[PDB]
Amino acid sequence: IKLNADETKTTKAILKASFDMWLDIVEADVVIVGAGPSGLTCARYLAKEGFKVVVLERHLAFGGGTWGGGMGFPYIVVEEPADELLREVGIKLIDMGDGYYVADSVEVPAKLAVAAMDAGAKILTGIVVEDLILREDGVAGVVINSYAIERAGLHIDPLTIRSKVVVDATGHEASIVNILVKKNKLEADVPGEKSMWAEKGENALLRNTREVYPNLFVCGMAANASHGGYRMGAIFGGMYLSGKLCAELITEKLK
């Protein structure tokens, strides 16, 4: 095989493509912060509904804290009936009894990401949300920068993405909600997660998945961190449901 490869043609193709993408993407319907299990589920459902969705993830790879499974052991758990949310995306499960299923902790994030992308959602990695955009209305988008710039420690201004809604799906950090409260000196505490009580934790998640400030929703562990809910460890049924519920709430508000 003769392959025709040229530096300039390669460079320009990347540049050209990246530009059409960037100019288009800086206005969107929904921005999801965090490409974890809850954020990617939310993204799936919103995109199926025809919304223009961007998922932003600080690390170069999506996935959040799924890859390592439980203490390095590469399986994660899902309980009935949230297992359907995995089946529905082609993820193979193993039945371990009593409504408990496991899945390869590398297979899960891959297939959740593909579902999201194939549903229409855009995922940008290597991108840090450092702040929010505000209007009198409430939250109006996100202020973004490059992970590389952040790690490198450089003093460089950001860019923006305007959106109708922002979703904090950043895990136990609840880092977008914290930014809102700290920088805008709101009289409210983000308490953070309590200790482990899997049952209390999993069930609180759905109650705690809501709009916490105008145009700002939380899902996944960010929801329990924001409302002082218990944690559940390497069981993900509530994560997936929270993401879906979050998409339903947003769909309602936005139609």
Ligand X SMILES: Nc1ncnc2c1ncn2[C@@H]1O[C@H](COP(=O)(O)OP(=O)(O)OC[C@@H](O)[C@@H](O)C(=O)CO)[C@@H](O)[C@H]1O
Site track 167-206 with a copy of itself (rule: CB under 8 A), x = hit: ----x-------xx--xxx-----xxxxxxxxxxxxx--x
222 contacts ligand X (rule: CB under 6 A): yes
**Shortest CA distance to 253 belongs to which of 121, 137, 96?**
137
Per CB under 8 A, which of residues 92..151 are in contact with a copy of itself?
94, 96, 98-102, 104, 106-107, 109-111, 113-114, 117-118, 122-126, 131-135, 141, 143-151
Site string for a copy of itself, 140-169 (x = CB under 8 A): -x-xxxxxxxxxxxxxxxxxxxx-------
Question: Which of ligand X, a copy of itself, none is residue 164 near (CB under 5 to 8 Å by kind)?
Answer: none
Report d(CA 149, CA 126) in Å as an integer: 10
Residue 59, marked binder: no
Which stretch of DSSP H or E encloses residue 36?
none
Contact call for residue 77 and a copy of itself (CB under 8 A): yes
The verdict on 231 binding ligand X (CB under 6 A) reads: yes
The DSSP bridge partners found for residue 217 are 167, 211
Out of 58, 111, 164, 244, the only residue in the binding site for ligand X (CB under 6 A) is 58
Residues 6+ apart with CB under 8 A from 166: 30, 31, 33, 132, 139, 141, 142, 176, 215, 216, 217
When the beta carbons of 96 and 254 are compared against a copy of itself, the nearer one is 96
Answer with the entry of ligand X, a copy of itself, none that 170 interacts with (C-beta below 5 to 8 A by kind). Answer: ligand X
Sign (positive or negative) of CA dihedral 39, 89, 119, 203: negative
Q: Per rule CB under 6 A, is residue 221 in the interface with ligand X?
A: yes
